[PDB]
Amino acid sequence: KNGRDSEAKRLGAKRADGQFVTGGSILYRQRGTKIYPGENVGRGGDDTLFAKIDGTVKFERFGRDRKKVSVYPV
Amino acid sequence: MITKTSKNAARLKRHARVRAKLSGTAERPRLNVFRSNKHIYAQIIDDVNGVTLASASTLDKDLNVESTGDTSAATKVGELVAKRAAEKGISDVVFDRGGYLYHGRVKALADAAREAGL
Amino acid sequence: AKLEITLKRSVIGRPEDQRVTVRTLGLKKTNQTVVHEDNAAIRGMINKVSHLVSVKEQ
RNA sequence: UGGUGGCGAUAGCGAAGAGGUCACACCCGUUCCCAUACCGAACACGGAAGUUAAGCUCUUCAGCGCCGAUGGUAGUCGGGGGUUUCCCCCUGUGAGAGUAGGACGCCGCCAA
RNA sequence: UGGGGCGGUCGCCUCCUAAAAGGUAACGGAGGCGCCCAAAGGUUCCCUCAGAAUGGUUGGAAAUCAUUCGCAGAGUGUAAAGGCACAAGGGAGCUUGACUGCGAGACCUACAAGUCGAGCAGGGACGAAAGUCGGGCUUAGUGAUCCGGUGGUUCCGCAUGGAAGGGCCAUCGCUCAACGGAUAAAAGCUACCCCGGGGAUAACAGGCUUAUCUCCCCCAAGAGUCCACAUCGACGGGGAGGUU
């Protein structure tokens, strides 16, 4: 049968919004790239988001529809 | 009908590929060339605002040459743009392949601009 | 522009948010009365809990 | 008229008409140079024979496409009322969808 | 599957149930992994489709050149895919999967126990300016402790000098697969058995449900020379009653 045969959850989503972050602070946890690094942040091996600078977090549109970089400390 | 494909289009795609990683946006600007049948251009682009701080093409008088391009006039204009970008040249610049293999006029003007700080 | 707010129904049997709003407004017993100055925040508070409150503008 | 840029096609994608004068390039090539993977096709390299015939600038056109209301409506928020499976009433909210339309872009920089 | 027996099942990944943050149960629905190999993976350049789609010796009639078109089929998959269109889908150089470490942060909130991607700095490297050397989006499993081996030892060594013995740093080896792992250990048989607790199996005894089960209508094809409804009755529908 299917019984349980499932997995554990990965609590993956957003972690900061409109607030002031530090260096490295994780901002989002994705599996592909629904969000792109628009301003001075990076992307880890498993598609994570960085800060690289302590500043204020923004979420803007990529300018191109159907895509949102939505990352801009300071 | 085999039709015909534009030469410039591949140049634009190559420029986009080389421009993805290229910045030449702050202070040290980007220097791009425009190889053409007439001659080759040379100008400065500082992004964030967008201005040409300094520039020197070949069809701008102040001594010329029969070829006004090709191989030897590549150097002949290379050192000329170099001094132009020296008297007003500040700090260094990043060279933009522009979409043309280094080998050739590009390499030529480059070493001239190497003296002009790159 | 002071106005009076009177508690007209008990809070027993009400969800927690309504109870917290009523307590923050200052009311603690049934048939109590209190005065406040009229602004948008007070109007919103009244809008949240309005079936347990009678408002009169002195 | 190039180079170099910016904003969601209202940019598109066509269709037509103009010029090509510059330009940008076709284009003569291939000396040299890069060739080519294989193959002057590119690829460099050499000039300029012929150029606009394209290409380059326009000029129109919603033909497409794009954008898009008002206005309802579905749904829903908190209070109620009943045959309380469900329905109703009041309080807010408010889609999709279609549609009126808009729209054949603009905005730069350095040349010229 | 217990009135009672008659079974799979445990660890990890991905999707529904899950109520537009995050978390959420049931013997609730669907699929998997105990790996790799190897093409690898750095880098610099070069790209372009793909299913169809013009013509087509002969296969591929069409490896066939040429029409036409979407960033498209493809992207070890083991596995669905779920997110990802350069989602890094297609070809060209000497490195490859380095050594010290580390700021935060996300989990956990169990300090737990274990996890996760971290900029950055120093020694020395490939390819080319910049990457990257810290392999290729998330399963292999890093199953600890504990044992044994393989190397190094600025360490200690019972009065002294040694040695036998140990410490410390790297390492290779358990389906400990009931995978947070009682001790290397383990079928029964006992209406011959014995002790302590439990509210129930007893057997609705009564209780709930009415699947059923009984019983009755509504509709009427037809049958009945004939003729629906003298006697009926297909066919559906909708109910009662408490016996099983």
CSV table of all heavy atoms in Angstrom, one decimal, chain D residues 88-103:
chain,number,residue,atom,x,y,z
D,88,C,P,-30.9,32.3,0.0
D,88,C,OP1,-31.2,32.7,-1.4
D,88,C,OP2,-29.4,32.2,0.2
D,88,C,O5',-31.4,33.4,1.0
D,88,C,C5',-32.9,33.6,1.1
D,88,C,C4',-33.2,34.1,2.4
D,88,C,O4',-32.8,33.2,3.4
D,88,C,C3',-32.5,35.4,2.9
D,88,C,O3',-33.1,36.6,2.3
D,88,C,C2',-32.7,35.3,4.4
D,88,C,O2',-34.0,35.7,4.8
D,88,C,C1',-32.5,33.8,4.6
D,88,C,N1,-31.1,33.5,5.1
D,88,C,C2,-30.6,34.0,6.3
D,88,C,O2,-31.4,34.7,7.0
D,88,C,N3,-29.4,33.6,6.7
D,88,C,C4,-28.6,32.8,5.9
D,88,C,N4,-27.4,32.6,6.3
D,88,C,C5,-29.1,32.4,4.6
D,88,C,C6,-30.3,32.7,4.3
D,89,C,P,-32.2,37.8,1.9
D,89,C,OP1,-32.4,38.2,0.4
D,89,C,OP2,-30.8,37.6,2.3
D,89,C,O5',-32.8,39.1,2.7
D,89,C,C5',-33.6,38.9,3.9
D,89,C,C4',-32.9,39.5,5.1
D,89,C,O4',-32.2,38.4,5.9
D,89,C,C3',-31.8,40.4,4.8
D,89,C,O3',-32.2,41.7,4.5
D,89,C,C2',-31.0,40.4,6.2
D,89,C,O2',-31.6,41.3,7.1
D,89,C,C1',-31.2,39.0,6.7
D,89,C,N1,-30.0,38.2,6.5
D,89,C,C2,-29.0,38.3,7.5
D,89,C,O2,-29.2,39.1,8.5
D,89,C,N3,-27.9,37.6,7.5
D,89,C,C4,-27.7,36.7,6.4
D,89,C,N4,-26.6,36.0,6.4
D,89,C,C5,-28.7,36.6,5.4
D,89,C,C6,-29.8,37.3,5.5
D,90,C,P,-31.3,42.7,3.6
D,90,C,OP1,-32.0,43.9,3.2
D,90,C,OP2,-30.6,42.0,2.5
D,90,C,O5',-30.2,43.2,4.7
D,90,C,C5',-30.5,44.3,5.6
D,90,C,C4',-29.5,44.4,6.7
D,90,C,O4',-29.3,43.1,7.2
D,90,C,C3',-28.1,44.8,6.3
D,90,C,O3',-28.0,46.2,6.1
D,90,C,C2',-27.3,44.3,7.5
D,90,C,O2',-27.5,45.2,8.6
D,90,C,C1',-28.0,43.0,7.8
D,90,C,N1,-27.2,41.9,7.1
D,90,C,C2,-26.1,41.4,7.7
D,90,C,O2,-25.7,42.0,8.8
D,90,C,N3,-25.4,40.4,7.2
D,90,C,C4,-25.8,39.8,6.0
D,90,C,N4,-25.1,38.9,5.5
D,90,C,C5,-27.0,40.3,5.4
D,90,C,C6,-27.7,41.3,6.0
D,91,U,P,-26.8,46.9,5.1
D,91,U,OP1,-27.0,48.4,5.0
D,91,U,OP2,-26.8,46.1,3.8
D,91,U,O5',-25.4,46.6,5.8
D,91,U,C5',-25.2,47.2,7.2
D,91,U,C4',-23.9,46.7,7.7
D,91,U,O4',-24.0,45.2,8.0
D,91,U,C3',-22.7,46.8,6.8
D,91,U,O3',-22.2,48.1,6.7
D,91,U,C2',-21.7,45.8,7.4
D,91,U,O2',-21.1,46.3,8.6
D,91,U,C1',-22.7,44.7,7.7
D,91,U,N1,-22.8,43.6,6.7
D,91,U,C2,-21.8,42.7,6.5
D,91,U,O2,-20.8,42.8,7.2
D,91,U,N3,-21.9,41.8,5.5
D,91,U,C4,-23.0,41.7,4.7
D,91,U,O4,-23.0,40.8,3.8
D,91,U,C5,-24.1,42.7,4.9
D,91,U,C6,-23.9,43.6,5.9
D,92,G,P,-22.1,48.9,5.4
D,92,G,OP1,-21.2,50.1,5.4
D,92,G,OP2,-23.5,49.2,4.8
D,92,G,O5',-21.4,47.9,4.4
D,92,G,C5',-20.2,48.2,3.7
D,92,G,C4',-19.0,47.6,4.6
D,92,G,O4',-19.5,46.5,5.4
D,92,G,C3',-17.8,47.1,3.8
D,92,G,O3',-16.8,48.1,3.6
D,92,G,C2',-17.3,46.0,4.6
D,92,G,O2',-16.5,46.4,5.7
D,92,G,C1',-18.6,45.4,5.2
D,92,G,N9,-19.3,44.5,4.3
D,92,G,C8,-20.6,44.6,3.8
D,92,G,N7,-20.9,43.6,3.0
D,92,G,C5,-19.8,42.8,3.0
D,92,G,C6,-19.6,41.5,2.3
D,92,G,O6,-20.4,40.9,1.6
D,92,G,N1,-18.3,41.1,2.6
D,92,G,C2,-17.3,41.7,3.4
D,92,G,N2,-16.2,41.0,3.5
D,92,G,N3,-17.6,42.8,4.0
D,92,G,C4,-18.8,43.3,3.8
D,93,U,P,-16.7,49.0,2.3
D,93,U,OP1,-16.3,50.4,2.6
D,93,U,OP2,-17.9,48.8,1.4
D,93,U,O5',-15.5,48.3,1.6
D,93,U,C5',-15.7,47.2,0.7
D,93,U,C4',-14.9,46.0,1.0
D,93,U,O4',-15.7,45.0,1.8
D,93,U,C3',-14.3,45.2,-0.2
D,93,U,O3',-13.0,45.7,-0.5
D,93,U,C2',-14.3,43.8,0.4
D,93,U,O2',-13.2,43.5,1.2
D,93,U,C1',-15.6,43.7,1.2
D,93,U,N1,-16.8,43.4,0.5
D,93,U,C2,-16.9,42.2,-0.2
D,93,U,O2,-16.0,41.4,-0.2
D,93,U,N3,-18.1,42.0,-0.8
D,93,U,C4,-19.2,42.8,-0.9
D,93,U,O4,-20.2,42.5,-1.5
D,93,U,C5,-19.0,44.0,-0.2
D,93,U,C6,-17.9,44.3,0.5
D,94,G,P,-12.8,46.5,-1.8
D,94,G,OP1,-11.7,47.6,-1.7
D,94,G,OP2,-14.1,47.0,-2.5
D,94,G,O5',-12.1,45.4,-2.8
D,94,G,C5',-12.8,45.1,-4.1
D,94,G,C4',-13.0,43.6,-4.2
D,94,G,O4',-13.8,43.1,-3.0
D,94,G,C3',-13.8,43.1,-5.4
D,94,G,O3',-12.9,42.9,-6.5
D,94,G,C2',-14.5,41.9,-4.9
D,94,G,O2',-13.6,40.8,-4.8
D,94,G,C1',-14.9,42.4,-3.5
D,94,G,N9,-16.1,43.2,-3.5
D,94,G,C8,-16.2,44.4,-2.9
D,94,G,N7,-17.4,45.0,-3.1
D,94,G,C5,-18.1,44.0,-3.8
D,94,G,C6,-19.5,44.1,-4.2
D,94,G,O6,-20.3,45.0,-4.1
D,94,G,N1,-19.8,42.9,-4.9
D,94,G,C2,-18.9,41.9,-5.2
D,94,G,N2,-19.4,40.8,-5.8
D,94,G,N3,-17.7,41.8,-4.7
D,94,G,C4,-17.3,42.9,-4.1
D,95,A,P,-12.8,43.9,-7.7
D,95,A,OP1,-11.6,44.8,-7.6
D,95,A,OP2,-14.1,44.7,-7.9
D,95,A,O5',-12.6,43.0,-9.0
D,95,A,C5',-13.3,41.7,-9.1
D,95,A,C4',-12.4,40.6,-8.8
D,95,A,O4',-13.0,39.7,-7.8
D,95,A,C3',-12.1,39.7,-10.0
D,95,A,O3',-10.9,40.1,-10.8
D,95,A,C2',-11.8,38.4,-9.3
D,95,A,O2',-10.5,38.3,-8.7
D,95,A,C1',-13.0,38.4,-8.3
D,95,A,N9,-14.2,38.0,-8.9
D,95,A,C8,-15.3,38.9,-9.0
D,95,A,N7,-16.4,38.3,-9.6
D,95,A,C5,-15.9,37.0,-9.9
D,95,A,C6,-16.6,35.9,-10.5
D,95,A,N6,-17.8,36.0,-10.9
D,95,A,N1,-15.8,34.8,-10.6
D,95,A,C2,-14.6,34.8,-10.2
D,95,A,N3,-13.9,35.7,-9.6
D,95,A,C4,-14.6,36.9,-9.5
D,96,G,P,-11.1,40.6,-12.3
D,96,G,OP1,-10.0,41.5,-12.8
D,96,G,OP2,-12.5,41.1,-12.6
D,96,G,O5',-10.9,39.2,-13.1
D,96,G,C5',-10.0,38.2,-12.6
D,96,G,C4',-10.5,36.8,-12.9
D,96,G,O4',-11.6,36.4,-12.1
D,96,G,C3',-11.1,36.7,-14.4
D,96,G,O3',-10.0,36.4,-15.3
D,96,G,C2',-12.0,35.5,-14.2
D,96,G,O2',-11.3,34.3,-14.2
D,96,G,C1',-12.6,35.8,-12.8
D,96,G,N9,-13.8,36.7,-12.9
D,96,G,C8,-13.8,38.0,-12.4
D,96,G,N7,-15.0,38.6,-12.6
D,96,G,C5,-15.7,37.6,-13.3
D,96,G,C6,-17.0,37.7,-13.8
D,96,G,O6,-17.8,38.6,-13.7
D,96,G,N1,-17.4,36.5,-14.4
D,96,G,C2,-16.6,35.4,-14.6
D,96,G,N2,-17.1,34.4,-15.2
D,96,G,N3,-15.3,35.3,-14.1
D,96,G,C4,-15.0,36.5,-13.5
D,97,A,P,-9.8,37.4,-16.6
D,97,A,OP1,-8.7,37.0,-17.5
D,97,A,OP2,-9.8,38.8,-16.1
D,97,A,O5',-11.2,37.2,-17.4
D,97,A,C5',-11.6,35.9,-17.8
D,97,A,C4',-13.1,36.0,-18.2
D,97,A,O4',-13.9,36.1,-17.0
D,97,A,C3',-13.5,37.2,-19.0
D,97,A,O3',-13.2,37.0,-20.4
D,97,A,C2',-15.0,37.3,-18.7
D,97,A,O2',-15.7,36.3,-19.4
D,97,A,C1',-15.0,37.0,-17.2
D,97,A,N9,-14.7,38.2,-16.5
D,97,A,C8,-13.5,38.5,-15.8
D,97,A,N7,-13.6,39.7,-15.2
D,97,A,C5,-14.8,40.2,-15.5
D,97,A,C6,-15.5,41.4,-15.1
D,97,A,N6,-14.9,42.3,-14.3
D,97,A,N1,-16.8,41.6,-15.5
D,97,A,C2,-17.3,40.6,-16.3
D,97,A,N3,-16.8,39.5,-16.7
D,97,A,C4,-15.5,39.3,-16.3
D,98,G,P,-12.1,38.0,-21.1
D,98,G,OP1,-11.2,37.2,-22.1
D,98,G,OP2,-11.4,38.9,-20.1
D,98,G,O5',-13.0,39.0,-22.0
D,98,G,C5',-14.0,38.4,-22.9
D,98,G,C4',-15.3,39.1,-22.7
D,98,G,O4',-15.7,39.0,-21.3
D,98,G,C3',-15.3,40.6,-23.0
D,98,G,O3',-15.4,40.9,-24.4
D,98,G,C2',-16.6,41.0,-22.2
D,98,G,O2',-17.7,40.7,-22.9
D,98,G,C1',-16.4,40.2,-20.9
D,98,G,N9,-15.6,40.9,-19.9
D,98,G,C8,-14.3,40.6,-19.5
D,98,G,N7,-13.9,41.4,-18.6
D,98,G,C5,-14.9,42.3,-18.4
D,98,G,C6,-15.0,43.5,-17.6
D,98,G,O6,-14.1,43.9,-16.8
D,98,G,N1,-16.2,44.2,-17.8
D,98,G,C2,-17.2,43.8,-18.7
D,98,G,N2,-18.2,44.6,-18.7
D,98,G,N3,-17.1,42.7,-19.4
D,98,G,C4,-15.9,42.0,-19.3
D,99,U,P,-14.2,41.7,-25.1
D,99,U,OP1,-13.8,41.2,-26.4
D,99,U,OP2,-13.0,41.9,-24.1
D,99,U,O5',-14.8,43.2,-25.2
D,99,U,C5',-16.2,43.3,-25.5
D,99,U,C4',-16.8,44.4,-24.6
D,99,U,O4',-16.8,44.0,-23.2
D,99,U,C3',-16.0,45.7,-24.6
D,99,U,O3',-16.2,46.5,-25.7
D,99,U,C2',-16.6,46.4,-23.3
D,99,U,O2',-17.9,46.9,-23.5
D,99,U,C1',-16.6,45.1,-22.4
D,99,U,N1,-15.4,45.0,-21.6
D,99,U,C2,-15.2,45.9,-20.6
D,99,U,O2,-16.0,46.7,-20.2
D,99,U,N3,-14.0,45.7,-19.9
D,99,U,C4,-13.0,44.8,-20.1
D,99,U,O4,-12.0,44.7,-19.4
D,99,U,C5,-13.3,43.9,-21.2
D,99,U,C6,-14.4,44.0,-21.9
D,100,A,P,-15.0,47.3,-26.4
D,100,A,OP1,-14.8,47.0,-27.9
D,100,A,OP2,-13.7,47.1,-25.6
D,100,A,O5',-15.4,48.9,-26.2
D,100,A,C5',-16.8,49.2,-26.0
D,100,A,C4',-16.9,50.5,-25.3
D,100,A,O4',-16.8,50.2,-23.8
D,100,A,C3',-15.8,51.5,-25.5
D,100,A,O3',-16.1,52.3,-26.6
D,100,A,C2',-15.8,52.3,-24.2
D,100,A,O2',-16.9,53.2,-24.1
D,100,A,C1',-16.0,51.1,-23.2
D,100,A,N9,-14.7,50.5,-22.8
D,100,A,C8,-14.4,49.2,-23.1
D,100,A,N7,-13.2,48.8,-22.7
D,100,A,C5,-12.7,50.0,-22.0
D,100,A,C6,-11.6,50.3,-21.4
D,100,A,N6,-10.6,49.4,-21.2
D,100,A,N1,-11.4,51.5,-20.9
D,100,A,C2,-12.4,52.4,-21.0
D,100,A,N3,-13.6,52.2,-21.6
D,100,A,C4,-13.7,51.0,-22.1
D,101,G,P,-15.3,52.2,-28.0
D,101,G,OP1,-15.2,53.5,-28.7
D,101,G,OP2,-15.8,51.0,-28.9
D,101,G,O5',-13.8,51.8,-27.5
D,101,G,C5',-12.7,52.6,-27.8
D,101,G,C4',-12.2,53.3,-26.6
D,101,G,O4',-12.7,52.6,-25.4
D,101,G,C3',-10.7,53.4,-26.4
D,101,G,O3',-10.2,54.7,-26.9
D,101,G,C2',-10.6,53.4,-24.9
D,101,G,O2',-10.9,54.6,-24.2
D,101,G,C1',-11.6,52.3,-24.6
D,101,G,N9,-11.2,50.9,-24.8
D,101,G,C8,-11.8,50.0,-25.6
D,101,G,N7,-11.2,48.9,-25.7
D,101,G,C5,-10.0,49.1,-25.0
D,101,G,C6,-8.9,48.2,-24.7
D,101,G,O6,-8.8,47.0,-25.1
D,101,G,N1,-7.9,48.8,-24.0
D,101,G,C2,-8.0,50.1,-23.5
D,101,G,N2,-6.9,50.5,-22.8
D,101,G,N3,-9.0,50.9,-23.7
D,101,G,C4,-10.0,50.4,-24.4
D,102,G,P,-9.3,54.6,-28.3
D,102,G,OP1,-9.8,55.7,-29.3
D,102,G,OP2,-9.2,53.3,-28.9
D,102,G,O5',-7.9,55.1,-27.8
D,102,G,C5',-7.8,56.0,-26.6
D,102,G,C4',-6.8,55.5,-25.7
D,102,G,O4',-7.3,54.2,-25.1
D,102,G,C3',-5.4,55.1,-26.3
D,102,G,O3',-4.5,56.2,-26.3
D,102,G,C2',-4.9,54.0,-25.3
D,102,G,O2',-4.3,54.6,-24.2
D,102,G,C1',-6.2,53.3,-24.9
D,102,G,N9,-6.5,52.1,-25.8
D,102,G,C8,-7.7,51.9,-26.5
D,102,G,N7,-7.7,50.8,-27.1
D,102,G,C5,-6.5,50.2,-26.8
D,102,G,C6,-5.9,48.9,-27.2
D,102,G,O6,-6.4,48.1,-27.9
D,102,G,N1,-4.7,48.7,-26.6
D,102,G,C2,-4.0,49.6,-25.8
D,102,G,N2,-2.8,49.3,-25.4
D,102,G,N3,-4.5,50.8,-25.4
D,102,G,C4,-5.7,51.0,-26.0
D,103,A,P,-3.9,56.7,-27.8
D,103,A,OP1,-3.4,58.1,-27.7
D,103,A,OP2,-4.9,56.5,-28.9
D,103,A,O5',-2.7,55.7,-28.1
D,103,A,C5',-1.8,55.3,-27.0
D,103,A,C4',-1.3,53.9,-27.3
D,103,A,O4',-2.3,52.9,-27.0
D,103,A,C3',-0.8,53.7,-28.7
D,103,A,O3',0.6,53.9,-28.8
D,103,A,C2',-1.2,52.2,-29.0
D,103,A,O2',-0.1,51.4,-28.8
D,103,A,C1',-2.3,52.0,-28.0
D,103,A,N9,-3.6,52.0,-28.6
D,103,A,C8,-4.5,53.1,-28.6
D,103,A,N7,-5.6,52.8,-29.3
D,103,A,C5,-5.4,51.5,-29.8
D,103,A,C6,-6.3,50.7,-30.6
D,103,A,N6,-7.5,51.1,-31.0
D,103,A,N1,-5.8,49.5,-30.9
D,103,A,C2,-4.6,49.1,-30.4
D,103,A,N3,-3.7,49.8,-29.7
D,103,A,C4,-4.2,51.0,-29.4
